[PDB]
Amino acid sequence: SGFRKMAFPSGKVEGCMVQVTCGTTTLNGLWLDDVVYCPRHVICTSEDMLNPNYEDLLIRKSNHNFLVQAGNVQLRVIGHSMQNCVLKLKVDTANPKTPKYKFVRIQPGQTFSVLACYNGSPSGVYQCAMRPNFTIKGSFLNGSCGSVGFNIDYDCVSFCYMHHMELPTGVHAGTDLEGNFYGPFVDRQTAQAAGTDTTITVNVLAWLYAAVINGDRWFLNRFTTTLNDFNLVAMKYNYEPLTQDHVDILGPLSAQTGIAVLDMCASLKELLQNGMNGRTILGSALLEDEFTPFDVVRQCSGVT
Amino acid sequence: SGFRKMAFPSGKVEGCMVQVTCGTTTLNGLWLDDVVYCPRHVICTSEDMLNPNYEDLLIRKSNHNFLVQAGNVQLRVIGHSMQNCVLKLKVDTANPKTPKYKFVRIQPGQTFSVLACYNGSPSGVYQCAMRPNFTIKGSFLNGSCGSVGFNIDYDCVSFCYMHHMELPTGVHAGTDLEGNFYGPFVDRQTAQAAGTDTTITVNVLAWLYAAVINGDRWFLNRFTTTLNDFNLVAMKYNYEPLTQDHVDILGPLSAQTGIAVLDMCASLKELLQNGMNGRTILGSALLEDEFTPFDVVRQCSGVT
Numbered sequence: 001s002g003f004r005k006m007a008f009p010s011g012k013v014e015g016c017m018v019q020v021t022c023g024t025t026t027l028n029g030l031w032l033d034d035v036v037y038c039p040r041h042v043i044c045t046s047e048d049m050l051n052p053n054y055e056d057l058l059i060r061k062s063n064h065n066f067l068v069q070a071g072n073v074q075l076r077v078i079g080h081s082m083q084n085c086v087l088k089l090k091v092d093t094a095n096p097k098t099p100k101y102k103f104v105r106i107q108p109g110q111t112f113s114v115l116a117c118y119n120g121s122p123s124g125v126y127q128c129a130m131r132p133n134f135t136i137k138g139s140f141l142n143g144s145c146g147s148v149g150f151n152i153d154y155d156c157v158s159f160c161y162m163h164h165m166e167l168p169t170g171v172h173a174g175t176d177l178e179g180n181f182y183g184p185f186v187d188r189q190t191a192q193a194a195g196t197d198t199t200i201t202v203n204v205l206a207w208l209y210a211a212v213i214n215g216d217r218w219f220l221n222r223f224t225t226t227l228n229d230f231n232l233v234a235m236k237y238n239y240e241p242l243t244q245d246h247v248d249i250l251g252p253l254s255a256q257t258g259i260a261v262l263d264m265c266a267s268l269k270e271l272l273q274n275g276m277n278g279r280t281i282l283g284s285a286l287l288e289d290e291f292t293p294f295d296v297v298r299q300c301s302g303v304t
Numbered sequence: 305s306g307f308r309k310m311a312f313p314s315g316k317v318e319g320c321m322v323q324v325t326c327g328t329t330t331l332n333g334l335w336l337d338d339v340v341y342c343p344r345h346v347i348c349t350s351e352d353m354l355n356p357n358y359e360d361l362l363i364r365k366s367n368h369n370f371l372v373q374a375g376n377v378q379l380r381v382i383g384h385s386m387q388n389c390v391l392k393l394k395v396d397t398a399n400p401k402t403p404k405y406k407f408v409r410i411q412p413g414q415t416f417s418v419l420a421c422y423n424g425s426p427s428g429v430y431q432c433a434m435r436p437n438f439t440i441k442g443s444f445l446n447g448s449c450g451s452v453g454f455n456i457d458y459d460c461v462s463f464c465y466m467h468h469m470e471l472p473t474g475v476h477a478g479t480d481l482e483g484n485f486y487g488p489f490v491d492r493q494t495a496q497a498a499g500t501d502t503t504i505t506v507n508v509l510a511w512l513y514a515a516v517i518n519g520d521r522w523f524l525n526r527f528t529t530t531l532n533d534f535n536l537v538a539m540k541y542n543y544e545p546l547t548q549d550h551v552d553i554l555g556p557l558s559a560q561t562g563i564a565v566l567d568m569c570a571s572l573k574e575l576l577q578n579g580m581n582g583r584t585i586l587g588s589a590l591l592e593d594e595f596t597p598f599d600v601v602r603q604c605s606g607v608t
């Protein structure tokens with residue numbers, strides 16, 4: 001019983017964190033096998049960030065200009081290349097702590113854990129979601145670049161995010177592990193505005209199912225709705241449209257509780273229209289959208 | 305920028321998790337040096353839990369009746385003793401992954417990270433607080449007993465909690481690593497009710513300072529108050545009384561923001577009296593009390 005914003009155990013990722021310095025810029029790198037992955041803006045000075053030509057700036061850098069430190073020991077850089085917005089530094093030593101891993105590009109609405117790091121050292125772990133506007137609401141300070149986002153399936157770490165940038169609004173942008181930014185963001189010190197941060201409806205529904213499983217049931221109403229009727233309401237409240245794909249994914253939660261997906265949509269519709277009236281659900285006074293239906297099943301079943 | 309409920313990186317604790325089985329009961333153990341610590345109710349059947357005499361039940365158990373498995377390998381139990389509500393199983397092998405560690409008994413209001421485990425395997429990490437009624441609001445399923453709570457200072461893990469029990473209300477109770485329960489709880493299948501779960505005022509104030517640091521400032525008012533006036537309001541809203549010790553601990557946050565502690569108390573007083581009016585602070589529609597002033601300083605400074 002109880003429901004928490006839970007992150008994956010970070011050990012497997014902690015074993016991969018390294019410090020990468022180029023010139024006077026220091027950030028985090030991810031050491032997997034004999035490659036260290038880091039944001040390409042490690043080669044930039046603050047002045048370079050205004051309008052960087054990364055290919056040009058990289059010509060002035062050789063293998064010995066990239067200082068990679070794993071713990072208190074120096075790794076020897078024997079090759080370097082740029083893949084989109086990430087640098088791949090080939091080192092002469094495979095990371096002995098390399099876990100089984102994959103690189104995945106996630107969809108908006110998907111959740112992951114972040115191991116926030118500074119100087120190659122882990123400071124904390126938290127759970128977040130890729131927003132529908134392709135930003136993340138993280139907790140990152142200067143030096144946090146190169147910290148990564150990931151999910152774990154038994155013994156396999158799927159790396160999905162690498163932190164690159166803070167927007168002028170204090171929200172965060174980054175890339176997958178192939179260096180492609182999520183969303184339209186560019187690694188440049190130029191004002192970039194994020195789009196509408198809509199609520200991830202399927203995740204709110206998953207969290208309403210988690211609340212019923214854990215005993216918070218006051219919000220269950222006597223109504224039902226249709227996908228089209230619900231979506232008219234969802235549109236009005238800047239919620240993402242619900243599709244039959246989302247209904248399908250909520251099926252195991254509907255089966256466990258005996259509450260039809262469309263009945264739960266009608267409960268959500270009434271909560272949107274009437275508010276919480278000073279009440280709480282799972283210790284929250286607002287509708288939580290950073291738990292996927294998979295996260296709810298995982299937490300409520302105890303997958304390790 | 306950004307503010308998250310952040311847990312400590314769990315790696316150091318993951319390396320200590322083991323599975324302990326006695327008869328047909330299986331739970332988690334914490335392997336540090338050559339000792340495995342686990343809840344004493346590992347020796348109980350479900351029938352025994354109704355009215356257990358642990359000293360009597362333990363007479364029927366020998367070293368070979370405790371099966372300790374670390375990963376997929378079996379540890380040899382060469383001694384066993386009961387210390388309060390925990391069993392200490394001496395094994396013939398020191399844990400090679402034992403981090404630098406201390407056992408601490410925390411005060412109510414203090415926060416810690418929990419590495420929730422099942423069958424000796426970590427499932428997730430989350431941050432919580434020792435409530436003023438000595439319960440924790442965790443996320444624990446059957447098999448989670450023996451999962452631990454901890455804090456980390458650079459390379460030293462301070463273990464503060466070991467999970468033992470779920471109360472009939474779905475809140476959690478457990479012990480320090482010396483086996484002494486927090487609060488008046490007993491390891492028995494008997495209905496035990498928790499006292500008033502008051503709000504940890506000093507933590508709410510720390511989180512209001514975190515909000516100002518991160519740009520959420522709408523709640524700052526033109527008023528000030530006194531400790532006695534504030535505490536009259538705090539009493540009325542089931543908030544813990546604020547003392548000069550709490551004011552002293554908020555000093556670094558007051559210094560960073562230039563907002564006197566008593567001015568922040570007056571802002572909190574108005575929020576209690578007027579509510580949030582549909583607004584949010586740091587993404588929350590309620591006042592958060594699971595961040596200590598130390599946690600806010602740590603997250604806002606990037607301690608690793």
Ligand SMILES: Nc1cncc2c1CCCN2C(=O)Cc1cccc(Cl)c1
Nearest residue numbers: 041140141142164165166187188189305
């Ligand atoms: N607090 C914080 C969090 N996450 C990143 C950053 C900060 C503060 C300063 C460093 N930083 C950046 O965003 C630096 C940067 C500038 C322009 C483009 C890119 Cl790719 C990066």
Ligand SMILES: Nc1cncc2c1CCCN2C(=O)Cc1cccc(Cl)c1
Nearest residue numbers: 001345444445446468469470491492493
């Ligand atoms: N869901 C859950 C979470 N945390 C613990 C437990 C559960 C469900 C069943 C196991 N369990 C217990 O509390 C078993 C127990 C009974 C009586 C006294 C003590 Cl010390 C322990």
